């Protein structure tokens, strides 16, 4: 007994059989090729000053405006940790690549471009709208991601120009509601603004495609709850104004119902691929798991195309030279193995999702249950990397990870610690600005103390401290064990160096929809720990208090 994903699946099926193949899936065999780990961050062990020199232009060069990297003739003109490179994703519609000073984090761009240009049937993108800090209401992507996507689609149009059939391209973003600059009473104006920015995004794509092409491209926005004054559709015990809105938070790039990129990354260039990068993780996986991703998309897209009534969302499509309202509610989820699909490491994988709070029935939150069960059944260790574990409610109330039929994450971690299981946690830093941890390490320690004081344990405070001091270690991310304002956006956990989650579902609470996958494989986990967990942990900071 060292936790198996089949146990998670069986538990969900016993308790939530009506959501089988809606918010979770039977484990399936999938394949991880070299580079499947899309971990982006500053280079652990160096300094921010040095890493950030990777974006300084030298020797009669400039900073390219599309990709926000220095131009380039050879490695000697590139500073920091960067090198001169001519990536395919810089190839514009006329076929010309650029020489840029690239860094390891750009691997994510490489992964996206390569996957999209290979499409023969469908490109399915789900994400979170870029935050409106000040700028102009951007959609779907920002910075280098945008150019990358455009360039990919351009290439795709050429690769498919003789295709028997058209390629369906779906871009869908969850949108904050009420939107920046509008009270919740102004739904109509909100829709108009969303429509405008989506139209501009689509028109920009269109202007880099051949006049005649086989790409049917749709852009859409999805929000499922704007009530604020009442429940969105969940079984929470906690109540807060900030839990009474909801929209998609899942992050998927799904090509041909075969290749999936999923994890914590939004497609926000400045946050990941420029100075002072935020630490984040996605993965690139091939196999039947893509079916689940597609179902997830289809759920959302079905909701966008047909919901009537309550909230009203918006979308538009460009195909055969025309803007239309042909809504792509459904891409087929039936898996067809591509040739040489079994290349790479075979691993067992299931999906888990959160699709309640206004899309599906209020019981449809199987992600929380899955992770609580995982932690409750850890036998050796739980490694967690997150942005935050708690979330500040509207009037300062601390909101904790949500209640499930099996309890909360914090109750499960308390159980683990009481049993002697090691719990290592990495949060973002407190001085993380937009990506703050929200609460310091002492707060989490004391919260778990209080859990052990109540409940079935009834432990006296100092005796409980013994368990915590032995088995709980809370650190926050740092590039080098010195800097105290670095940032992380991870949604990662690993049980027994064997089973791990990658997806969008923070441990801190919200009502947003989520998608993620659970991998069960010792070899894959060992790779992930060698590449990300161990360097990050080694360089993290611990506040003793």
Q: Angle 207-213-215 (CA atoms, 0-180°, nearest 5)?
A: 85
Whose tokens are 């509610």? That residue is 329
Cβ count near 481 (within 10 Å): 13
Smallest distance, a second copy to C-beta of residue 182, A: 6
Instruction: Give the count of beta carbons closer than 10 Å to the beta carbon of residue 529.
Output: 17
Closer Cβ to Na ion, 268 or 272, answer by number: 272
The binding track of 59-98 with respect to a second copy, each residue x by CB under 8 A or -, is ----------------------------------------
- Paired strand residues for 495: 382, 499
Binds Na ion by CB under 5 A, chosen from 40, 71, 154, 367: 40
| Residue 457: alpha-carbon gap to chain centroid | 35
Q: Which of 374, 426, 464, 517 binds Na ion (CB under 5 A)?
A: 426
Residue from 165, 192, 461, 470 touching a second copy (CB under 8 A): that is 192
174 binds Na ion (CB under 5 A): no
Rounded Cα–Cα distance for residues 111 and 35 (Å): 9
Choose the contact partner of 126 out of Na ion, a second copy, none; CB within 5 to 8 A by kind. Na ion
Cβ atoms of 282 and 492 within 8 Å: the answer is: no
Q: Is the dihedral of CA 532, 538, 542, 544 positive or negative?
A: positive
Of 30, 52, 70, 257, the residue at the interface with Na ion (CB under 5 A) is 70
Stretch touching a second copy by CB under 8 A, among 27-35, 192-200, 451-459, 498-506: 192-200
Regarding 183 and contact with a second copy (CB under 8 A), the answer is: yes
Q: Is 542 in the site for a second copy (CB under 8 A)?
A: no
Tokens of 342: 């079994």
- Binding segment (CB under 8 A) for a second copy, from list 129-137, 291-299, 400-408, 494-502: 129-137
Q: Is 448 helix (H, G, I), strand (E, B) or coil?
A: helix
Check the chain for breaks (C–N over 2.5 Å) and list the residue before each, or none.
none
Closest to 125 in 3D by CA, of 90, 93, 153: 153
SS3 content of the chain, % helix, strand, coil (to 5): 30, 25, 45
Q: Identify the residue among 11, 41, 150, 491 touching Na ion (CB under 5 A).
A: 41
Contact footprint for a second copy (CB under 8 A): 131-133, 176, 178, 180-185, 188-189, 192-193, 196, 199-200, 203, 228-231, 239, 241-242, 244, 308-309, 316, 322-325, 392, 394-397, 430-431, 433-434, 439-440, 443, 485
Contact footprint for Na ion (CB under 5 A): 40-42, 55, 68-70, 101, 103, 105-106, 115, 124, 126, 144, 170, 172, 253, 255, 259, 261, 269, 272-274, 277, 279, 297, 385, 401-402, 426, 477, 488, 490, 509
């Amino acid at each position: 007994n060292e936790l198996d994903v089949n146990d998670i699946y069986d538990h969900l099926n016993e308790k939530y059989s009506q959501f089988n193949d809606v918010t979770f899936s039977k484990p399936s065999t999938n394949y991880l090729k070299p580079g499947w780990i899309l971990d982006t961050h500053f280079t652990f062990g160096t300094s921010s000053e040095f890493y950030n020199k990777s974006f300084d232009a030298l020797s009669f060069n400039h900073v390219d405006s599309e990709f926000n990297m220095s131009t380039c003739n050879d490695d000697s003109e590139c500073g920091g940790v960067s090198t001169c490179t001519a990536p395919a994703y810089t190839k514009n519609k006329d076929g010309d690549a650029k020489k840029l000073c690239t860094v390891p984090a750009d691997k994510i761009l490489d992964a996206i471009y390569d996957n999209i240009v290979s499409a023969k049937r469908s490109v399915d993108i789900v994400t979170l709208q870029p935050m409106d800090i000040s700028h102009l209401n951007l959609s779907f992507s920002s910075g280098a991601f945008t150019a990358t996507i455009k360039n990919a689609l351009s290439q795709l149009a050429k690769n498919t120009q003789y295709s028997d059939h058209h390629i369906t391209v779906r871009l869908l973003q969850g949108s904050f509601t009420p939107m920046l600059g509008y009270d919740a009473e102004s739904e109509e104006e909100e829709i108009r603004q969303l429509s405008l920015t989506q139209t501009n995004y689509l028109s920009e794509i269109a202007s880099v495609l051949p006049e005649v092409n086989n790409l049917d491209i749709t852009v859409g926005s999805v929000r499922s709850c704007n009530k604020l004054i009442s429940n969105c559709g969940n079984n929470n015990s906690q109540k807060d104004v900030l839990l009474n809105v909801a929209w998609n938070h899942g992050k998927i790039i799904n090509v041909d119902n075969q290749s999936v990129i999923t994890g914590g990354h939004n497609l926000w260039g400045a946050d990941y691929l420029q100075r002072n990068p935020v630490n984040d993780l996605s993965i690139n996986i091939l196999g039947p798991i893509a079916s689940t991703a597609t179902k997830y998309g289809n759920t959302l897209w079905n909701y966008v195309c047909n919901n009537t009534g309550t909230i009203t969302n918006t979308f538009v499509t460009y195909a055969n030279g025309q803007y239309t309202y042909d809504c792509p509610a459904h891409i087929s989820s039936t898996y067809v193995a591509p040739t040489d699909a079994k290349n790479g490491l075979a691993v067992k994988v299931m999906s888990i999702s959160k699709l309640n709070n206004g899309v599906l029935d209020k019981d449809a939150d199987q992600s929380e249950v899955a992770r609580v069960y995982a932690f409750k059944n850890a036998t050796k260790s739980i490694k967690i990397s997150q942005q935050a574990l708690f979330f500040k409610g509207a009037f300062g109330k601390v909101l904790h990870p949500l209640k499930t039929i099996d309890g909360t994450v914090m109750e499960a971690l308390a159980s683990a610690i009481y049993k002697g299981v090691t719990v290592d946690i990495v949060t973002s830093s407190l001085d993380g600005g937009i990506y703050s941890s929200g609460y310091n390490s002492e707060f989490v320690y004391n919260y778990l103390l209080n859990v052990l004081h109540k409940a079935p344990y009834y432990l006296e405070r100092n005796y409980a401290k013994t368990f915590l001091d032995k088995n709980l270690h809370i650190n926050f991310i740092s590039i080098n064990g010195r800097e105290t304002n670095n940032m992380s956006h991870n949604k990662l956990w690993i049980v027994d160096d064997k089973v791990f989650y990658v997806g969008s579902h923070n441990i801190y609470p919200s009502s947003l929809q989520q998608f993620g996958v659970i991998v069960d494989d010792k070899d894959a986990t060992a790779q992930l720990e060698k590449q990300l967990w161990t360097p990050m942990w080694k360089n993290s900071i611990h506040v003793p208090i």
